[PDB]
């Protein structure tokens, strides 16, 4: 044991072991197991990061402090390092020469207990073109005979996939389940441990900072378990604060520092509003109104949802908002969403629903079951939302997807999560979900038969209700019905498209101007209520872009100047220049 194990009582005496707080029941059972007649070997099994190791070392600490029932008094717990145990065993018999020597020392002592951390790794020592006769085979006869006592440690997964496969070995250990602690329990663990962190970092934590770390970590960090996730927030806040006195910002760790640290760890903002990002939100609606004309209520619904989430008055666990945009073609449904993601500076995740045309295509979004060919691919949707947790999610033409693919969104909209084929959860609490559709349009565009004309204005809603199941609709934030574009809007749209053309030309070094009448003429010529703005793009292409392309390609406009377009009155034809 001289270079194979560590005396944990010795470490407790010199301060190498952090103290245990609580866990009386988990420790009491271990003591009872160790006092059995045979197979008196507890095994600590649980999720990682819950104190499995802390308890085993914690016992050595309590023995040193004398805080034990006096059956444990004077026991010594030794920690075994497998890595040094096998390091020199090159020759046949060396592994059996060391392993037996250690066992004899333990058996002879009788007060000692051996602690084997990560016990699933003692299922191999020999491998010399032979088989069996390894560390497990050499230990079994002492365990069932009551000659030695050992303490094990393993996670549930390792214990279900590896350790338990050897039933004879498994029956020689007594499994104890260590569960993750409660909120109050976690706060108390931190309060008793903080003097170690304060000393290391030369910081002091406030009482509120400790509670905030525990409660925030629970709400935002879903990858780990308590207390370890809360401890990390505290330790990182400490490490961070210690790099502030460098600019002489000596301070304590307050709630505000905890909130900043959690926001960074989880990749989500919280106390970053105090910044003039407020300005970005304040005039978000205006920037979007300069890009999409009309359709103002749609713009407001989006900006209202964002501000509430930022203000803090959000949904406990739902997407920022969930909206269905519906209406006639070419009126900006797609445009409003696209410009929003640009205005906010965040990623747009685009999915085109006509791809999810058939029922089984849903596995494309979430991944194949275990045992299937695409298993290692993951899902396309759950992966996108993990890579970018703050985003705008756009599902175009959700009226073309499988009538059953809607059932995936159903659980997302209400709970904020989706689970992939490996059990990972995508978290949608920070995304904006926008779905677009033409579902109610065909029905309002009808000619009635009779002497008195009828009002068809309620038919759009009558058709949407027949497509989207009530359990789906009842969880949307809204349905925004978009209008047809008016002629006032067309004038604004025409100006918009001309500017885009001017930019394309500036790039080549030439410059276009259009007289106001020439613009009025184009606007009138291309108006069609039935198809929104798409025809205006076509009219401009035909009237301004074609002539220019030929002047630019066959000389004339090639490396030229001023092209002035004006309308004559006699033919209503356009002029051109250089």
Ligand X SMILES: Nc1ncnc2c1ncn2[C@H]1O[C@@H](COP(=O)(O)OP(=O)(O)OP(O)(O)=S)[C@H](O)[C@H]1O
Residue 295 site contact among a second copy, ligand X, none (CB < 5 to 8 Å, cut-off depends on kind): ligand X
Q: Could you say whether residue 422 binds a second copy (CB under 8 A)?
A: yes
Q: Around Cβ 221, how many Cβ atoms within 10 Å?
A: 17
Interface positions, 257-296, toward ligand X (CB under 6 A): 292-295
Residue 270 site contact among ligand X, a second copy, none (CB < 5 to 8 Å, cut-off depends on kind): none
**Is the distance from CB of 302 to CB of 285 less than 8 angstroms?**
no
Q: Could you say whether residue 324 binds ligand X (CB under 6 A)?
A: no
Residue 493 site contact among ligand X, a second copy, none (CB < 5 to 8 Å, cut-off depends on kind): ligand X
* Phi and psi at residue 93, to the nearest 5°: 95, -15
Residue 550 site contact among a second copy, ligand X, none (CB < 5 to 8 Å, cut-off depends on kind): a second copy
Q: Could you say whether residue 534 binds a second copy (CB under 8 A)?
A: yes
Q: Could you say whether residue 327 binds a second copy (CB under 8 A)?
A: no
Q: Could you say whether residue 532 binds ligand X (CB under 6 A)?
A: yes
The CB-of-320 to ligand X minimum distance in angstroms stands at: 17
Spell out the residues 6+ positions from residue 285 whose beta carbon is closer than 8 angstroms to its own: 299, 300, 303
Near a second copy by CB under 8 A, which window of 238-246, 448-456, 488-496, 514-522? 238-246
d(CA 59, CA 42): 13
The CB-of-350 to a second copy minimum distance in angstroms stands at: 8
Site string for ligand X, 291-320 (x = CB under 6 A): -xxxx-------------------------
Q: What is the dihedral of CA 47, 50, 54, 58, to 10 degrees?
A: -110
Helix, strand, coil share of the chain (percent; to 5): 50, 15, 40
Q: Could you say whether residue 282 binds a second copy (CB under 8 A)?
A: yes
Whose Cβ is closer to a second copy: residue 76's or residue 361's? 361
Residue from 15, 374, 403, 561 that binds a second copy (CB under 8 A)?
A: 374
Helix/strand/coil for 506: helix
d(CA 552, CA 546): 10
d(CA 179, CA 50): 7
d(CA 376, CA 383): 12
Residue from 51, 319, 327, 330 that binds a second copy (CB under 8 A)?
A: 330
Residue from 106, 193, 480, 518 that binds ligand X (CB under 6 A)?
A: 193
Q: Could you say whether residue 20 binds ligand X (CB under 6 A)?
A: yes
Q: Which of 288, 294, 346, 296 is nearest to 320 (CA)?
A: 346
Which residue's structure tokens are 């020439």? 518
Q: Could you say whether residue 228 binds ligand X (CB under 6 A)?
A: yes
The CB-of-188 to ligand X minimum distance in angstroms stands at: 8
Token pair in block for residue 127:
């491998």
Cα dist from 526 to 486, 536, 568, 573, whole Å: 13, 6, 18, 15
Q: Could you say whether residue 133 binds a second copy (CB under 8 A)?
A: yes
d(CA 304, CA 109): 73
Q: Could you say whether residue 535 binds ligand X (CB under 6 A)?
A: no
Whose Cβ is closer to ligand X: residue 229's or residue 310's? 229
Q: Which of 479, 446, 440 is nearest to 460 (CA)?
A: 440
The CB-of-258 to a second copy minimum distance in angstroms stands at: 14
Whose Cβ is closer to a second copy: residue 15's or residue 141's? 141
The CB-of-259 to ligand X minimum distance in angstroms stands at: 22
Q: CB-side exposure of 120: number of CA atoms within 13 Å?
A: 14
Whose Cβ is closer to ligand X: residue 532's or residue 560's? 532
Site string for ligand X, 478-507 (x = CB under 6 A): -------x---x---x--x-----------
Helix/strand/coil for 121: helix
Q: Which of 280, 268, 205, 272 is nearest to 236 (CA)?
A: 205
d(CA 47, CA 26): 15
Q: Could you say whether residue 77 binds ligand X (CB under 6 A)?
A: no
Q: What is the DSSP string of 262-293?
A: HHHHHT--SS--TTTTHHHHHTHHHHHHTTS-
Q: Could you say whether residue 76 binds ligand X (CB under 6 A)?
A: no
The CB-of-570 to a second copy minimum distance in angstroms stands at: 26
Q: Around Cβ 228, how many Cβ atoms within 10 Å?
A: 18
Interface positions, 419-478, toward ligand X (CB under 6 A): 436, 438, 471, 474
Residue 285 site contact among ligand X, a second copy, none (CB < 5 to 8 Å, cut-off depends on kind): none
Parallel, antiparallel or unpaired: strands 417-419 and 425-427: antiparallel
Site string for ligand X, 134-163 (x = CB under 6 A): ----------x--------x-x--------
d(CA 410, CA 398): 13
Helix/strand/coil for 434: strand
Q: Could you say whether residue 538 binds a second copy (CB under 8 A)?
A: yes
Q: Could you say whether residue 18 binds ligand X (CB under 6 A)?
A: yes
Binding-site ranges for ligand X (CB under 6 A): 18, 20-23, 48-54, 144, 153, 155, 168, 171, 189, 192-193, 227-228, 231, 292-295, 329-335, 436, 438, 471, 474, 485, 489, 493, 496, 532-534, 537
């Amino acid at each position: 044991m001289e270079n194979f194990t560590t005396n944990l009582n010795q470490l407790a005496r010199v301060g190498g072991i952090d103290p245990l707080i609580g866990r009386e029941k988990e420790l009491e059972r271990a003591i009872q197991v160790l006092c059995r007649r045979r197979k008196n070997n507890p095994l600590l099994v649980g999720e990682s990061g819950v104190g499995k190791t802390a308890i085993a070392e914690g016992l050595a600490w309590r023995i040193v402090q004398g805080d034990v029932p006096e059956v444990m008094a004077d026991c010594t717990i030794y920690s075994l390092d497998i890595g040094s145990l096998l390091a020199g065993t090159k020759y046949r018999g060396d592994f059996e020469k060391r392993f037996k020597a250690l066992l004899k020392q333990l058996e002879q002592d009788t007060n000692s207990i051996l602690f084997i951390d990560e016990i699933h790794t003692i299922i191999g020592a020999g491998a010399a073109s032979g088989g069996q006769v390894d560390a497990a085979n050499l230990i079994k006869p002492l365990l069932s005979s009551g000659k030695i006592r050992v303490i094990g440690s393993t996670t549930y997964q390792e214990f279900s996939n590896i350790f338990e496969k050897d039933r004879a070995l498994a029956r020689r250990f007594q499994k104890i389940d260590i569960t993750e602690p409660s909120i109050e329990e976690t706060v108390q663990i931190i309060n008793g441990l903080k003097p170690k962190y304060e000393a290391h970092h030369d910081v002091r934590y406030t009482a509120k900072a400790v509670r905030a770390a525990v409660e925030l970590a629970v709400k935002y960090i879903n990858d780990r378990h308590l207390p370890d996730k809360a401890i990390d927030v505290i330790d990182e806040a400490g490490a961070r604060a210690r790099l502030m006195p460098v600019s002489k910002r000596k301070k304590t760790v307050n709630v505000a520092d905890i909130e900043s640290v959690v926001a960074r760890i989880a990749r989500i903002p919280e106390k970053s509003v105090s910044q003039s990002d407020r300005d970005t939100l304040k005039n978000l609606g205006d920037r979007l109104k300069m890009l999409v004309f009309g359709q103002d209520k749609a713009i407001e619904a989006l900006t209202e949802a964002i501000k509430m989430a930022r203000a803090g008055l959000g949904h406990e666990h739902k997407p920022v908002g969930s909206f269905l945009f519906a209406g006639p073609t070419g009126v900006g449904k797609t445009e409003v969403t696209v410009q929003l993601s640009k205005a906010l500076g965040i990623e747009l995740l685009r999915f085109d629903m006509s791809e999810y045309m058939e029922r089984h295509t849903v596995s494309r979004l979430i991944g194949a079951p275990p045992g299937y060919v695409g298993f290692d691919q993951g899902g396309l949707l759950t992966d996108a939302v993990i890579k970018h947790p703050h985003a705008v999610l756009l599902l175009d033409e959700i009226e073309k997807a499988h009538p059953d693919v809607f059932n995936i969104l159903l659980q997302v909209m209400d709970n904020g999560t989706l689970t992939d084929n490996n059990g990972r959860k995508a978290d949608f609490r920070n995304v904006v979900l926008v779905m677009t559709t033409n579902a109610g349009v065909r029905e309002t565009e009808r000619k009635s038969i009779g002497l008195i004309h009828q009002d068809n204005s309620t038919d759009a809603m009558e058709e949407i209700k027949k497509i989207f199941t009530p359990e789906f609709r009842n969880r949307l934030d809204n349905i925004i019905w978009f209008d047809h574009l008016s002629t006032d809007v067309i004038h604004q749209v025409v100006d918009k498209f001309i500017v885009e053309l001017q930019v394309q030309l500036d790039q080549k070094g030439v410059s276009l101007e259009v007289s106001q009448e020439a613009r009025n003429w184009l606007a009138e010529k291309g108006y069609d209520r039935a198809m929104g703005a798409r025809p205006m793009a076509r009219v401009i292409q035909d009237n301004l872009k074609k002539p220019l392309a030929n002047e630019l390609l066959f000389g004339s406009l090639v490396d030229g100047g001023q092209v002035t377009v004006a309308l004559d009155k006699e033919k209503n034809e356009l002029t051109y220049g250089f």
